[PDB]
Write a protein that binds this ligand. Structure first.
Ligand SMILES: CC(=O)N[C@@H](Cc1cc(F)cc(F)c1)[C@H](O)CNC1(c2cccc(-n3cccn3)c2)CCCCC1
Length: 375
C-alpha cells in the first residue's frame, strides 16, 4: 500500500529532502534528511540555535546506551555525538517499528541549516561506509532484518519542493516509460559506471575512465551534479560555447554569482542537454539519461522582478556525484536486492516546450568495464 507514502517528503531548494520519523517511547517526532550519500542515522539530541526541537533520550522508556562516541564529516558540515539504540517509525511509510542504531548529536559544525526544518539525517548507503566502523548496521539494514519489508526503495524527487520515498517497493503511478537498470558496482556508496557523455549529442570523447575517477555515485544528500576536474572543465567549455551569445560573470560558472533575466524571458534553448550513458544489465549494453538545463540551473529567489539561477554543476575530486539535480528528472529505484539502480522518467518531470528529459535505451558500447577506475 504505497499510496500512503507518496508525498512524504519536503525540503527547501538546496537544503535536501526530509521524511517525518518517530523515535522512542512515547514516540518523538523529527524531520530526518534522506541521504543515499552516507550510512549513518543521526538526530540532534541537544539545543542548537538552528534546531527547533530535538531528541531527549531521558524521556524514552526504550533508549539503550552503547557507550561509544561517534564522529562523521560530510563534504562541509560535520557532527559528533553518542551512540544508543531505540525504537523508530515512519508515519508516512511502512507500518512497522524497528530497533535501530542512533547517533545522538551533542555538538556540530555547519550541519544544521537556518530555517532548515530538519533535525537529523538518514544515511541509506551501505554498512561498509558506516562510522565509526562497519559493524554499525545502518538504519535500512535493520529494517530489512527485523521485518518483511522488501530490500528495495525508491525516491521521486520533484522541483518549497516535495517528493516521495517508497519503502520496500515501486509505485507505478510515479513514472512513465520503462525502468532502466544499471548495476551497483560495489555495495558501499551507491556506486555506478558512466560509460559515455554527450552534450547536445556531441561526445566529450574522453577515456571513459575520467567519468568515474575515483567513483560515480547516486547521492540524494548532494544538491549538484559534481564532476571530476577534467570532466568538469570539458563540460564547462562545451556549455560556455553553446551559450556564448550571452555573457556572464565567472563566479557564475563556479556557482558564486547568480544570473538574471526578466520573468519568463529565460533563454532556455541556448543551454544544451547533457546525456549520461550508464552501464546496462546486459553485456555490451547501455542506456542514457538526458538532463535538461532546467535541472542544472537551480532557481534562487530575489532579493526581485527577475528570475535568478545558480549553476548546479560544480567541480569534484572524489568522483562524479549525481546529486538531487540529476535525480529530479527521474524515478530512481534502489534495487538493493539485485545490486542495481533503476531510472525512469519521473511523473513530476519539468516541461520545456521543445525538449524533454529522457531515459532512453538500448545502446551498444564496447569494453564497458574498461570504464571503472581501479586504485
Ligand atoms: C552536501 C553534503 O555534504 N551532503 C551529505 C549529506 C549532508 C546534507 C546536508 F544538507 C548537510 C550536511 F552536512 C550533510 C552527503 O552524505 C555527502 N555525500 C558524499 C560524502 C561526502 C563526505 C563524507 C561522506 N560520508 C560520510 C559518511 C560516509 N561517507 C560522504 C558521498 C561521497 C562523494 C562526496 C559526497
Amino acid at each position: 500500500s504505497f499510496v500512503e507514502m507518496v508525498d512524504n517528503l519536503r525540503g527547501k531548494s538546496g537544503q535536501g529532502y526530509y521524511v517525518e520519523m518517530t523515535v522512542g517511547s512515547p514516540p518523538q517526532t523529527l524531520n530526518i534528511l534522506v541521504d543515499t550519500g552516507s550510512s549513518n542515522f543521526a538526530v540532534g539530541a541537544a539545543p542548537h540555535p538552528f534546531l527547533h526541537r530535538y531528541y531527549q533520550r531521558q524521556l524514552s522508556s526504550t533508549y539503550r546506551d552503547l557507550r561509544k562516541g561517534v564522529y562523521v564529516p560530510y563534504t562541509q558540515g560535520k557532527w559528533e555525538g553518542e551512540l544508543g539504540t531505540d525504537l523508530v517509525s515512519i508515519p508516512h511509510g511502512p507500518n512497522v517499528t524497528v530497533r535501530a542504531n542512533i547517533a545522538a548529536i551533542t555538538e556540530s559544525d555547519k550541519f544544521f541549516i537556518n530555517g532548515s526544518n530538519w533535525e537529523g539525517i538518514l544515511g541509506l548507503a551501505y554498512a561498509e561506509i558506516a562510522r565509526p566502523d562497519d559493524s554499525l548496521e545502518p538504519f535500512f539494514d535493520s529494517l530489512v532484518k527485523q521485518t518483511h519489508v522488501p530490500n528495495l526503495f525508491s525516491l521521486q524527487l520533484c522541483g518549497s519542493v516535495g517528493g516521495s520515498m517508497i519503502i520496500g517497493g515501486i509505485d507505478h503511478s510515479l513514472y512513465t516509460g520503462s525502468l532502466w537498470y544499471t548495476p551497483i558496482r560495489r555495495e558501499w556508496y551507491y556506486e555506478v559506471i558512466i560509460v559515455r557523455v554527450e552534450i547536445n549529442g556531441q561526445d566529450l570523447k574522453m577515456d571513459c575512465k575520467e567519468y568515474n575517477y575515483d567513483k560515480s555515485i547516486v547521492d540524494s544528500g548532494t544538491t549538484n551534479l559534481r564532476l571530476p576536474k577534467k570532466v568538469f572543465e570539458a563540460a564547462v567549455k562545451s556549455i560556455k560555447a553553446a551559450s556564448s551569445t550571452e555573457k556572464f560573470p565567472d563566479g557564475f560558472w563556479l556557482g558564486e554569482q547568480l544570473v538574471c533575466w526578466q520573468a519568463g524571458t529565460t533563454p532556455w534553448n541556448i543551454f544544451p542537454v547533457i546525456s549520461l550513458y550508464l552501464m546496462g544489465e546486459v553485456t555490451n549494453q547501455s542506456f542514457r539519461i538526458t538532463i535538461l538545463p532546467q535541472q542544472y540551473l537551480r532557481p534562487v529567489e530575489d532579493v526581485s522582478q527577475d528570475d535568478c539561477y545558480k549553476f548546479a554543476i560544480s567541480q569534484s575530486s572524489t568522483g562524479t556525484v549525481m546529486g538531487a539535480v540529476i535525480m529530479e528528472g527521474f524515478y530512481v529505484v534502489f534495487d538493493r536486492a539485485r545490486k542495481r539502480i533503476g531510472f525512469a522518467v519521473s511523473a513530476c518531470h519539468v516541461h520545456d516546450e521543445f525538449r524533454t528529459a529522457a531515459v532512453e535505451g538500448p545502446f551498444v558500447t564496447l569494453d564497458m568495464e574498461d570504464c571503472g577506475y581501479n586504485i
